[PDB]
Amino acid sequence: KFSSQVSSSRRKSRKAHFSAPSSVRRKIMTAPLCKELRKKYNVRSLPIRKDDEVMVVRGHHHDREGKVTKVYRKKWVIHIERVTRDKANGETVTIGIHPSKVVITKAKLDKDRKALLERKSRAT
Amino acid sequence: GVAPNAGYQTSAESWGTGRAVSRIPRVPGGTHRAGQAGNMCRGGGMFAPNKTWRRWHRKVNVTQKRHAVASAVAATGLPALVMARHRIDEVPELPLVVSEKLEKVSKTREAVKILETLGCTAELERVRASAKKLRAGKGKMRGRRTHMRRGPLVVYAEDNGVTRAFRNIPGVELCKVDSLNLLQLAPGGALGRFCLYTASAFKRLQLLFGRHTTGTAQLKKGYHLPRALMSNADLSRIVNSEEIQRVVRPARVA
Amino acid sequence: YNWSEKAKRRHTTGTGRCRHLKDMPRRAKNNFREGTKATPV
Amino acid sequence: VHLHKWWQRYVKTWFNQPGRKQSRRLRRQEKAAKLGVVPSGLLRPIVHPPTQRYNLKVRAGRGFTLEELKSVGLSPRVALSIGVAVDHRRRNRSAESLNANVTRLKAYLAKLVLFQRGSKAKKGLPADTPKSQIQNVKHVKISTAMPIKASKRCKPRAITAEEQKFMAYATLRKALRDCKNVGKHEKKLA
RNA sequence: AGACCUGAAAUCAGGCGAGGUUACCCGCUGAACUUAAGCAUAUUAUUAAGCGGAGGAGAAGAAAAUAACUAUGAUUCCCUUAGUAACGGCGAGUGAACCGGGAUCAGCUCAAAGUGGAAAUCAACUGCUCUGUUGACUUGUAGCCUCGAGAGGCGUUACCAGUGGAAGCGCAGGGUUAAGUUUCUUGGGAAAGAACAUCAUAGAGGGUGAGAAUCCCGUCCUUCCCCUGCGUUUUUUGUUCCACGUACGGUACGCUUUUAUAGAGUCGCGUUCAUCGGGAUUUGAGCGCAAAAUGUGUGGUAGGUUUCACAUAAAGCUAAGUACUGGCGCGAGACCGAUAGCAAACAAGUACCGUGAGGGAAAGAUGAAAAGUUCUUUGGAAAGAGAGUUAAAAGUGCCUGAAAUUGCUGAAAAGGAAGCGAUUGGGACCUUGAUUCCAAGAAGUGCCGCCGGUUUGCCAUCUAUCCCUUUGCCUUCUCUCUCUCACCAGGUUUAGGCUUUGUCUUGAUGUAUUUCCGGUUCAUCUUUUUGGAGAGGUCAGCAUCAGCU
RNA sequence: UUGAAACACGGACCAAGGAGUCUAACAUAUGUGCGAGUACGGGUUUUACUCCUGUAUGCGCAAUGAAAGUGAAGUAGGGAGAUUUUGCUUUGCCAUUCUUCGCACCUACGACCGACCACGAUCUCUGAGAGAGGUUUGAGUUGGAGCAUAUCUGUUAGG
RNA sequence: AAAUCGUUCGUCAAACUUGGGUAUAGGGGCGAAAGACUAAUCGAACCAUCUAGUAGCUGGUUUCUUCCGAAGUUUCUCUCA
RNA sequence: AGCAAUGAGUAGGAAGACGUGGGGAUUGUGACGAAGCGUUCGGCGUAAGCCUGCGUGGAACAGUCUCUAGUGCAGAUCUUGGUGGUAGUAGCAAAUAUUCAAAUGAGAACUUUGAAGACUGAAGUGGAGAAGGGUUCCAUGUGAACAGCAAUUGGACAUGGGUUAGCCGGUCCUAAGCGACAGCUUAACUGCGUAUACAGUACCUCGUUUCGCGAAAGGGAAUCGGGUUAAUA
RNA sequence: AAAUUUUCAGCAAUGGAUGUCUUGGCUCGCGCAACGAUGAAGGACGCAGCGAACUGCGAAACGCAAUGUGAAUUGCAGAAUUCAGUGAAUCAUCAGAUUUCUGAACGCAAAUGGCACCUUGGGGUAUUCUCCUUGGUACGUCUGUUUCAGUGUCUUU
């Protein structure tokens, strides 16, 4: 919209999202933060990481929380501790949920992930 | 158009008379497709395949284009035609003219609160009612997801950021006065859109279109506004004046 | 032979591996840079 | 109708027509970015077309004339730097067509400001204009700057003696029938 | 014995060619089906197939040109000329060019002379930041010259090499940007509904458990800005800014004098064959003949005599506009929606057939999530049956699940077909104290009135411009064969600020009226339950008439 | 097909797919615009839309000859309608009763222009031309209608 | 079984039978000659293309009502479907 | 609205309607259930068709005025796909032939082992090679399908394993013939191709053939005995 | 009256139409100029911890180096270190490497890992021997070089 080399076609948009190189997915699977953390860092969003606390806002498990365990980027999913269901045979399986729906309680901080937040907060 | 040689890229021939089938050309060799058979066959040509040279565009004459835009602009006045074709309950006047301080307004924040004051709130709701609905039919695959209504058409002399402000408001268009297209003024072949003129834009219309009652209209060279076959538009004023009605007979029954 | 267009179609550039050729668009995009490296920041 | 050949191959369509307009139009602008101050094309002369049905009209020519540039006192060598076309083929048979284009050249060289190459001013090679320097507008295009208008009108005139008298059918009608019978006359004369 | 000349060799030293791709481009070669209602010339067609060669474009190109005018002025492309001139068993059919209006614009250099006080030139190998040693070369390499003149002769003026720095542009790979997940209802799930907020230079598009501007990626800002590296203004697909420079050379210009002078088995002609709209030859080719120097070529009818005009062939380079079903990378769509669209939405030029050239398919969809049915029980096992997962089995070729066809159950009918039309009947099965009117009671509803706030203004007045009626103009436009004419002025057309003149509205008077809460409660009518008065519907019988019989 | 229940041919059943289309050149008809006129580029722009515009050209405004060339006075009859006046239910009804003007259009005949044929007073005599013709001839003329666009139908070329 | 099976029958040391290698290709080959054979294809193979070749000749040609409603005859035609 | 007269129809012409896929405008329906599908719940229209109850279904669709078309099927020995009657029918009949017991197995006319009885009858249905095939060879295992009945069997299916050379062949030679050199043709594609300067660092003296392909039956260096493995000698 | 045949409905079967989807096609427009003796296009055979194909790759073989991003990949297995890091990834980018046997295909060949010669470096009575090992040897053509041939034209020792 007001720019060539940006397509508003439905095919091109869907193929781009679906083929998804692994590096690109990292940006697609982002999660918004708590209203506590928006006061500290001044960022709206963040890409999910394996070792994050997190709380589920939509769906069947609303106001459940825990630590993230897994980031199944091939399916656009995360798994969580506790959030599970049993099979027929009485043997537990982690339920996948999409990380747009989940919200981050508190983040991990490396050198890079901390110095991501300073890079984001030049805007705000 | 449909690809030239679609259907016909194959070395088929007729088996023909004597082998107890139709004479249509069949695929040779030995696949499942071998033996299989035109206009009518599976994997056949289309009849009269759509060429690219089909003449898509019309030249309309420049005078008929101008007469049309004049007629469409006339229907901007009269709340008969605007209500017929909108919500004109809170609107103080037609044609709705506003001052040239509108041209300097930049933000959409301000350009919403103006239209609440002038009272376009009912017809700026009916676009937002039709905003979310998925359109009936196969055009949803092909970019046309949604079938919104048409709102206010603001008309302006020169851009100082009106084009920024008003564009993002749902279903309200801009249009510079030099380039009055018919396709915004009379949408769906149908007269009388609700417009919103700037004061300088309203003023410039006389420099474009001219005098009505013999000399020409300045900017359009050699152009004059059209004249009806009547002067007086109606019957009932003319038919029921005293010059007609005394000479008229006394009526009859059966 | 031009009397068979399907015959040409079966056996032309791109039907195979294209080991030298596939890398060409990327190579020409950068004007054939040679004898250098990417810099550490 | 002439469609007995395989005409589907050679159908030219014009879907590019607007895309062609806008591609031309981009390279006119991107030309005039580089020039900026310098005007675009180059100056062309006034020229009567050839044969008898366009003989009245005037149009733009190709380029001037080695005779015409000698009067004003350009070299044919240098003139393309200033932006004047030279055409080495076109003569001046008439005095009238000469003095039209010489006026057109002299009026152009009155318009022409010419910058110094730097640092110091240098005469000739019109002149070096100093740093006084009245404001030039940007590229004007040169055709639009100095255009060609079918200059009409006649002075209303008294009808003289030997105007009403002379019979302009018979004057023409002699001039035909003389010009046919030229060699036929010279037998009858001699 | 030594100079050359010619021809070999080498796994000698260092280089260059070959083959591939098809959309567009260059050159050869070359049909027939078909049309003519037959057919042979003609047409298809100077096309397809065949054989060569390229490039980002290619070819074409600065007149041995058009013209016959007041003349034009490389080439290409568009529009027009023009379905014209012309060709044609003058049948069928075929068919350009000049002028004109546009895109785009750019010009030039070899041979023919002149270093002859002196090969000034070029390559290879080696050597410092441009010397040396071999060779090429006088059977001609530099400089000069290219008809627009050129060359000497004379005479003057004026020009021509650049370094600095600041900014900035282009290309590649990265990086950062607004606003709700707020309450209630439905549901497996809210992205749906209702109410209350917010952002908007962003309400393109997509994702997420159903229609998401505010949950997420994006979109606007953005041809921005910030890193990293290339290229660039000097080498610009035509020139950017100031600052400061110069003449050993070389090039212009003015006057005058002039003959050093311009491409050969080529031009041209005769014939033969092809080609063309080109016709007593448009262009080409073979063979034979074979030129000229005040010459030669062209001037659309063969030929001769006499003039005139236009060009300077037989050597060469050259960007742009133009073309583009291929390659590479983007953006769209009144297109198709799995018998469609490419042959191919999937391990498709695949499976498979042919000795081979070649031929060439079918095949998309469980669910939001595999939670893909453990466990008991029968059986050799496959499966079945309980139970279980799910919103649902939707139960693995699993969304919806039509018809043909098949099994059962129920319902009828049937003496060498059945169906069908029209008309009744039979059996299954479906379907119907109206409308109201008068009292009393509850549940609704809440008009006017009466206040505060708010908005319309019947009618009587006063008055504006619309419009035309010109007036006194003035200003800015516009048109005009209106004037000495180069400029001002004058008419014509518009706008504006002003003017004299005779049923779409302002400002005061307040018939009337809306909206707004607190009311101040009251009318009203609605549905309903209790009496009171009142019955429609349908099918008939008899009667009286009006028409036909 | 003159003639089909036919001892004429196609058809076992069901689903889905399947045949007057597109381009060009004309033509009549009709709708819309302007009317002696009428309708490749450039300039704008949010960029295939829209809007504006200079110079030509198209077809039309004049035809006629192979060509050189040359190149245009109405009248009468019937007629729409109006006007003046005579018959009938009345301030409205239809007359042809009137003389007044008579549109379009048809019928009859002219004049003028080009071609062909045949003359010619007189001049500035390769020519011009008063004047006057002709069982000849034109797709001529007689105070011009066309141009652009839309759709149908027809003819023709192309699958 | 797209040429087979049964009984019968022809010739059997030669102008005999036969494997492998090699030569001849489409208006061409090869032929003790039948127009035979040339990959189940032959009075001109097969594959692709020109090609959707042409057809005065067959067969088809997809909704409803409403109103009007034919001709198989004239002349010319390589015209008599 | 009124009055009167009229009403057949193939080929053909014209007029007004009905329906389908998309575009523009407008009015709406929908997870409390859209589209489609089924139906003796039904209704309206002369008719094309339209509306609608109930059931299934699970995500989008419709009315109105216009624009547009790949727009309506019973037929084409039409095309592709699916399914019948025929029908539990034709048929499974050449090559002389099987039988009894026990073992294995869910199950035995059909597997294996024994005992009988037959056939092939060394120009064999035996033992070895070539062409052609390509893992079919060998072992262990088995739910389907395939082996025109069956199947515990298998050239089927699955997981493993197996081919050892101086002497056996290829390799080397030349045959009919075939590729290229020198050149010669042709625009090339091709076609022809026997023409040519092709030993005793240094010193001599000789010098006519041009390179290669072409035989797993022609020519040709050399091998035999016994043993051995689930499958090689 | 059963049974059978036919008809209508209900349920089941068979079959895959209709409807709704769509990382595919088709068409138009706009940009860009980049294959090959420094071995191309195309072919053959290989390579994954557990792969047949399709994509990728070449004994460095679903990859290695560098740069950027900064924690996965995933059917299972394992590796866990690779976790405030000189670093996860079927990631992006790609400027450095590898690149078998072939193919214009180049020592001769070719239904053959066939048959030669020269050459580097090493291994086992030898200068001639066999072996492993490195890299070569096709055709046309230009400039230069070296060695020649010719009673070609000339001088002449």
How far, in Å, is the CA of A115 from the C1' of nucleotide E176?
A: 13
Under 8 Å CB pairs connecting chains B and D tally to: 4
Q: For the purposes of burial, counting CB atoms within 10 Å of the CB of D73, is it exposed (0-12), middle (13-18) or buried (19 or more)?
A: exposed
Residues of B in contact with A8 (CB under 8 A): 143
Q: Are B36 and B47 in contact (CB under 8 A)?
A: no
- Reading the block at residue B110, the tokens are 């301000």
Count of residues making up chain B: 254
**Interface touch B141/A10, C-beta < 8 Å:** yes
Q: Are A105 and A55 in contact (CB under 8 A)?
A: yes
Q: For the purposes of burial, counting CB atoms within 10 Å of the CB of D105, is it exposed (0-12), middle (13-18) or buried (19 or more)?
A: buried
Strand partners, A53: A67, A106
Measured CA distances, D97 to B134, D16, D67, D79 (Å): 73, 42, 12, 20
CA angle centred on A92, ends A87 and A96, rounded to 5°: 90
* Identity of the residue numbered A4: S
What does the alpha-carbon distance between residue D116 and residue D132 come to, in Å, rounded to a whole number? 12
Query: Chains near D, with 3+ CB pairs < 8 A?
Result: B
- Reading the block at residue D120, the tokens are 């110091």
What does the alpha-carbon distance between residue B191 and residue B77 come to, in Å, rounded to a whole number? 11
Put residue B43 in one of left, alpha, beta given phi > 0 → left and psi -120 to 50 → alpha.
left
What does the alpha-carbon distance between residue B157 and residue B103 come to, in Å, rounded to a whole number? 8
Number of Cβ within 10 Å of residue A106's Cβ equals 13
Q: Is the CB of C41 under 7 A from strand I?
A: yes
Measured CA distances, D43 to B78, B241, D24, D67, D89 (Å): 56, 71, 21, 16, 17
- Does a cis peptide bond (omega within 30 degrees of 0) precede residue D45? no
How far, in Å, is the CA of A71 from the C1' of nucleotide I13?
A: 47
Q: Do chains A and B touch (3 or more CB pairs under 8 A)?
A: yes
CA distance B38 to chain D (A): 21
Nearest CA in chain B to A13: B143
Instruction: Work out the angle between the directed axes of helices B62-74 and B199-209 (0-180°, nearest 10).
Output: 140
CA distance B201 to chain D (A): 29
SS (H, E, C) A64-119: EEEEEEECCCCCCCEEECCCEEECCCCCEEECCECCCCEEEEECCCCHHHHHHHHH
Q: Give φ, ψ of B62 to 5 degrees.
A: -75, -35
Provide the total of helices (H) and of strands (E) in chain A, helices listed first.
4, 8
Count of residues making up chain A: 124
Residue given tokens 């200033």 in the structure block:
D82
CA distance B110 to chain A (A): 23
Measured CA distances, D103 to B110, B123, D46, D49, D106 (Å): 60, 66, 10, 20, 5
Q: List chain G nucleotides near protein: any atom < 7 Å from a Cβ.
A: 47-49, 51-52
What does the alpha-carbon distance between residue C21 and residue C23 come to, in Å, rounded to a whole number? 5
Number of Cβ within 10 Å of residue D88's Cβ equals 9
CB proximity list for B30: less than 8 A, separation 6 or greater: none
- Reading the block at residue A92, the tokens are 């537990």
CB proximity list for B48: less than 8 A, separation 6 or greater: none
Q: Is the CB of C20 under 7 A from strand E?
A: no
Residues of B with CB under 8 A from a CB of D: 4, 52-53
Instruction: Work out the angle between the directed axes of helices D182-189 and D168-180 (0-180°, nearest 10).
Output: 80
What does the alpha-carbon distance between residue A67 and residue A45 come to, in Å, rounded to a whole number? 18
C-beta pairs of A57-65 under 8 Å, 24+ apart in sequence: A57/A101, A57/A102, A57/A103, A58/A101, A59/A97, A59/A101, A61/A95, A61/A97, A65/A105
CA–chain centroid gap for B17, Å, is 58
What is the rounded (10 degree) CA torsion for C14, C18, C22, C27? -130
Q: Are A102 and A54 in contact (CB under 8 A)?
A: yes
Q: For the purposes of burial, counting CB atoms within 10 Å of the CB of B25, is it exposed (0-12), middle (13-18) or buried (19 or more)?
A: middle
- Mutation target to probe the B interface, by most B beta carbons within 10 A, among A7, A10, A13 is A10
Pairing of strands B173-176, B153-156: parallel
Strand partners, B14: B25
